[PDB]
């Protein structure tokens, strides 16, 4: 009744939730020194954060960079993501730009994923979508709040919204301020699982207090959880090896 | 700040969670075939389902078996527990001889905690209670439904009731029949944390779908949690040393 997405060997939205380890380098050579020390680790799918590339504003070296890494891993999924500013990011570029880079990168054929964020806007993510469509690209529309967890109904609501707009995969993540909140993040977290959702979605609760909602996605409903290689990529995180223990556990509880 | 649970080298209601394992021995050979298995593991504390002992009805018997058990766990803390068949235990015996055996076992020094359960009404518990404390064992007042959830506010009422009958340690176990039911579970248990609490509290919602409200006490507020040696003595419960690394992974978070 809902759809999976696939992407080379492995199926989001099926059975246990799947590893996302993300690759954060400065620099070219730490990049491909992270690429080569992930290739034959436990892990479904590797995220570019982009946003971290120190020269991320010249389209030609982050192809290079892209050619280079897409040959360590060759058939690993990979989503592509530059994480703007508003939502966590530590790069400032321009909208203009942010559709460039997307797209150009999307023209390679050598990203399966690729994130664009829903504050972006229906320009922006309109044409995202259906060029990434057009190169058999899965998009993860994101949302992120550092501050606050909005109310079920609105976490709901958003995720809807994410899902009109041609969404594979919605994704949201946001801060709890109490336990509750986290609970509240799980709440819509199955609502929208077992009565809204019509495919996978990825949710999260930050910080250590949320870390619980990166581990029970089996049981609530979140497809994809992220874990880190050597350092974060959004705070409560854990290394992906430990995630890979848990959630192999709790496959089998 | 609140009241804290010394037993021996053990502060329940501090850092992590600690960790229970049971031991559900027949005969006298079994049960320290499990004692000796559990001497130097990674947990806490140790409970014996003494309704599982088939000589149960002779005090003499569960005696000699406290005996020999204390030789090998002497230091180790040690819950006594008569499980009865009302809230899942395998073994009939009259309330009179409930009442004896509690009371007489308590009576040796040799156990550190006993389970007394909540529905078996007041005239009970007072008894076991008062004389438990003058022995100085810990007790543990407890509540299991293997049929559904309570809603919150009937489970933080129980955990209240149980504080205020003098509970060491008020428990209830729970079996969730939605997902939602496990969150109910974690939210009251956290309300309990953070408004009603003197002492630390158990909680924990049974079955594979309930898993993790055994995993993440720290942050919801439950400060002991099950772990299975062998095999389970209640739905949904996990092997101890795995259960040790993902509390201790989740203290540092
Ligand atoms: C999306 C969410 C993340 C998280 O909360 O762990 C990690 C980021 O790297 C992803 O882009
Ligand atoms: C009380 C709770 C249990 C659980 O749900 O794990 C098992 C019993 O052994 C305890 O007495």
Same mark, same amino acid.
């Given at each position: ?11 989001? $939205?099926?059975?246990?939730?799947? @590893? ?7 620099n070219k +050579?730490?990049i ?6 992930? +290739?034959?680790?436990?892990?479904? @799918?590797?995220?570019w #954060?982009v *946003?971290?590339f120190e020269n991320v504003e010249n389209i030609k070296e982050v192809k290079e960079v892209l050619y280079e890494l897409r040959?360590?891993? !060759? ?5 592509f993501?530059f ?7 530590? +790069?400032?570029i321009? #909208? *203009?730009y942010?559709?460039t880079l997307n797209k150009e990168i999307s023209n390679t054929?050598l990203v *399966? ?12 993510? *309109? ?5 990434? !469509? ?9 949302? !992120?709040?550092?501050?606050? =967890? ?7 609501? #958003?995720?809807? #919204? ?45 910080? /250590?207090?949320?870390? @619980? &909602?990166?581990?029970? /996605?089996?049981?609530? $409903? &979140?497809?994809? =959880?992220? $874990? ?7 705070? $409560?995180?854990? &290394? ?10 709790? !496959?089998?509880?």
């Open positions: 009744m809902k759809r999976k997405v696939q992407v080379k060997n492995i199926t989001i $939205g099926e059975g246990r939730p799947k @590893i996302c380890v993300p690759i954060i380098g400065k +050579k730490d491909i020194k992270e690429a080569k020390e992930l +290739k034959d680790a436990c892990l479904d @799918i590797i995220e #954060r *946003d971290f040959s360590y891993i !060759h058939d690993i999924p990979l989503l993501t994480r703007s500013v508003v939502e966590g990011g530590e +790069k400032l321009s #909208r *203009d942010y559709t054929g *399966d994923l690729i994130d664009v964020e829903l504050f972006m806007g229906d320009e922006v993510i *309109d044409e995202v979508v259906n060029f990434a !469509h057009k190169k058999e690209v899965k998009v993860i529309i994101s949302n !992120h709040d550092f501050n606050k =967890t909005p109310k079920k109904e609105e976490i709901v609501s #958003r995720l809807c #919204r994410m899902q009109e707009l041609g969404a594979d995969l919605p994704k949201i993540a946001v801060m709890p301020q109490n336990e509750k909140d986290v609970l509240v993040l799980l709440e819509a977290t199955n609502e929208m699982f077992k009565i809204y959702a019509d495919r996978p979605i990825i949710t999260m609760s930050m910080s /250590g207090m949320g870390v @619980i &909602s990166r581990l029970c /996605g089996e049981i609530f $409903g &979140s497809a994809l =959880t992220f $874990g880190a290689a050597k350092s974060v990529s959004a705070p $409560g995180q854990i &290394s992906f090896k430990e995630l890979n223990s848990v959630l192999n556990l709790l !496959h089998k509880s």
